[PDB]
Symmetry: C2
Subunit: 641 residues, 2 copies
Amino acid sequence: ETQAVEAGEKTVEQFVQALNKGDYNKAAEMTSKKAANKSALSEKEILDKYQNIYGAADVKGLQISNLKVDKKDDSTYSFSYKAKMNTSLGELKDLSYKGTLDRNDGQTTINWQPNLVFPEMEGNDKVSLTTQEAARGNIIDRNGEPLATTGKLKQLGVVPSKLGDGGEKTANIKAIASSFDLTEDAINQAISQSWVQPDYFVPLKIIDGATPELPAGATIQEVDGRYYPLGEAAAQLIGYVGDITAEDIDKNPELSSNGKIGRSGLEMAFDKDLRGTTGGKLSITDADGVEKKVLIEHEVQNGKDIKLTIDAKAQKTAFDSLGGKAGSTVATTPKTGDLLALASSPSYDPNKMTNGISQEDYKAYEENPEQPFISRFATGYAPGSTFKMITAAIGLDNGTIDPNEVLTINGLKWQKDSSWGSYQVTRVSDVSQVDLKTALIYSDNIYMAQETLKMGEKKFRTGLDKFIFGEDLDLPISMNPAQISNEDSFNSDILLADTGYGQGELLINPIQQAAMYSVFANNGTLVYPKLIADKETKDKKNVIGETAVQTIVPDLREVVQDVNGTAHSLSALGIPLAAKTGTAEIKEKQDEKGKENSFLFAFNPDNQGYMMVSMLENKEDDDSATKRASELLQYLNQNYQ
Amino acid sequence: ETQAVEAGEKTVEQFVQALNKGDYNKAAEMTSKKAANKSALSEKEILDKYQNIYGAADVKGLQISNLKVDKKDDSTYSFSYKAKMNTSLGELKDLSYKGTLDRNDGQTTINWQPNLVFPEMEGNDKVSLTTQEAARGNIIDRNGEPLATTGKLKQLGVVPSKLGDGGEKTANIKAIASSFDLTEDAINQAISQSWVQPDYFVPLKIIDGATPELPAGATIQEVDGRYYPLGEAAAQLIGYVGDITAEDIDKNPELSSNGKIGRSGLEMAFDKDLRGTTGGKLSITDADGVEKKVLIEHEVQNGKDIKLTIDAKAQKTAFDSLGGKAGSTVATTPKTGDLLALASSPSYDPNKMTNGISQEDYKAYEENPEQPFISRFATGYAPGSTFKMITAAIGLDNGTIDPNEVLTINGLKWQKDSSWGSYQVTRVSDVSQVDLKTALIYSDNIYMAQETLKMGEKKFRTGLDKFIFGEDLDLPISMNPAQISNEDSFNSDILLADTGYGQGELLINPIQQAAMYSVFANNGTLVYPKLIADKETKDKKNVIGETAVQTIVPDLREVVQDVNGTAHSLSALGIPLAAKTGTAEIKEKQDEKGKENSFLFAFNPDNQGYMMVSMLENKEDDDSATKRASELLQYLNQNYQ
């Protein structure tokens, strides 16, 4: 009967999944009694064998194939199969397992033998694992400057024994507390943890400068560890690493139990390329200790470096220019798409995170209303009033907009008709006669709203659709694709109008904005941004017409040159600029009034060497993105031609 | 020299693309002079030949392959290639073209011959095309009732000659205007269009009932055409058809120039299956008229029917119950996912659209603030306070919620702390002691907000992620996938709290809501909705725990049974119900105050025969989804067990 063979195969498959799912006791309970021709061990001993051995090699994911179950005698059935499993040294493949089953009335059991752990095992053999951790690779900028590297850090700590009794003990703590900027309550709390022992060195802080006077008990020790040279200026992008946990290993055995793992940003995105592969040997030995079989063996491979398009000098300038306010700044070389800077403010100290951080300091980052953990350059926002230049291009392309047509606009508020109720589009300057150029120079939202309505939704979307809404940019930074609105239709003249000047339901992150605005530096060609230096330049032709660009850019030079251009403060710099400012009124439930976002777009219209998009989120009164752009503009202009 | 062969191949490729892009004059201008051994015709005559022939067969998309260009003599090069093109009768494939090129100094030209139109053509041959339009298929409900079919419509019209002079002419118009509900200005305007001729029959309207008294000039004629039996009650779903235009044919030659095309809803989604394929013959004949070659020939294939899960009776009831207000109602048989009703109100008359509609009536639909064209069942909305039951399930699954724990809540407003500013979560009933059951019965948002905050974002998302946010449901209805929020993180306790009771940045359309709530009728298993009757049932196991369902459903029965349950009016019906009401406060720019959306969720907890989700958008004071649910609930309960 194959009626028994059915159960035979079934038993082995159950045994196999029991091991696969790490439930060794369940597997043990499917074995025959301990005997000469049956199971070599008892259940408890089998359980202990797998737990000990499979645990030592971090075995995980036992999968089989080519199963066969024939019969040899009434009471015994032989079986065989190929198998593979993952370990802390990679996958073991094409392993040949075999043994026999014991049929008994309505019970089929496995005559367990040590060879069902690893095929070549017999009797009291042993397993040995040896390993070498791989060194983590580095993240460097476009010129080789380090962004994430491995430094030799100075570490301060105290030895309770060499501290004192009561007299100096209290005074020595004072000395080190002031000498190294440390709350003396943190020091006492540090030295009184359950693990601390009178003689041990109790680590306290990392000295990131020249080592000063050392009081009694205070001492410095070198330790290797990750180091982020730009600090918080590039924390959201770069991210940080943390101690590997038992839980991380459970998900991926190929990590180093004793190592570091990327917890955020690029460190995580490229954790694999950066961590390399563990070196080592997994072997079976005999009772004595002689090597009997090498299951896996390979030399360590250190992590490889990742070279970015980022310009460390630009990153820092972009970040510092935000003055610790909520905002972000993206800078590119629009003809190739290189991301020179990806700044987000406020930020967090990645060196503290990776070197052990106070549980209250961490919470301080989380509860901070300005949310430093957010990567603002990868977060979607209404693009703001700057978007008028896109709407304008579309209008010129489709013929809806005559640059010379002059709209007559009275006052600072406008609505199509009474169906809009109390809603009205708003502008800041009351200019009566407004043509396109005048609308761009003064940032006139009423003009663009009117032209958007004139154009109509069908044509406006036809133009928007030629951009990148909906697309997943090919970047190692988590983000959502830009959207025009929540649905395929606005179903609203108000929304259509608001979308026309960058408000409405538009969500476009800064990287996506720089991507879209690149058309003005490539005659209507859109150039996708890139972050990895070696990557090839990718673009998308005919997003807007060359005529539209040649019409609009001269107007954008006036936004700077003209005495009433919104970006005229930048004309003083004396460098060729084409720019466009913008705002975005946002509503919040917590705030009585509404918040305002300030934006700046700018590039060199002579050589198309650089481009930058900057924004201050929920700006303070009198603050502005333009007000903070000079240094970066001077720097990019100087080095990117 | 292959230097000339380069140009030879190039010339043919240019000639080919010129034809491909329909620019026949450009192709003609690459031919040699008219001669015995050169081109058979002049350019103007070649131009006219393609325009006439390729135009007659709606040729489009000429593509070649296996190009070869050898030489025969110093002055002549022979060429050949396989080709294919689309036509009004489908694609022509494996066509063998051949001819010769004329080299001359630095100019290579094609010695054009009629065989470069169709391969077997010679001299003064002709092309003939004959066709038979396919009959459009039908859209029927789960029991065969027609939803989109082809009826024989009665059409009223007038004959100006048989109308009068001045006396009866003015009086006869009065008679027909009142006898058929027609503005007599429309009648005069109708009979005075530039095309109208004294003797012609001027069509005016479609009589959708019994034909009444016929005044002088008024007459009725039968015409075949699409007919929608449910009318506006299923207009958004079904959609309508319109006259095929030259522009439609330009995009797809396989359509019938003389036919109908789906412009919206299912009629469009399944336009192809429904339209069938044109029958006909494309042949080449000789000067005389004798058939010389049949290029393509096949019999017509009428469109095939599409059978939906919809229950026409339920569709109409669901639609009528909305009383012309803005809203939508979805109904299913949650164990299989069948969509019994997909109602959206207000609506538009699909029979008017397909039978020619006033340009002002069409505009009336568009400018209507309630936007009847929107398919509300496929539009994303904040799910509302009903969502508390999902949040509750997650809380029970992860152990954050103890059903018996009693929160003490004072008043109708609550905020975590002062960081929330003036923002506060709000509830309608001031119940001091609130446990889960009590929170569900009274629809207590403060309770769920507190539990959501307690649970925390990481766990809340872990639970939400087991649902269908992000997924593209497999349905022939255009929609966007549901979203939890705009980003992967809320970055806000307020948003986290609001999301907990169905507000915040949640966007879930009604079909997606019914999909999610199906877990309560399948022990935590989610069952994907289906619209096509023959389609196989698809599900997703373990979205929530069986314990959570067994805990929550009894509470949902109390929402109906308990005297203070929000859905207690429905207890009168005397049918087994488990329900949950909800609201959603929305803000608008046009309105001074905020708008409110009312929702109802309900199903039979005894047999899981049906489920329904209904919503009134921007409801009028005192209106409610629950207030309008009885008839549908009585009907579904009766027929879906």
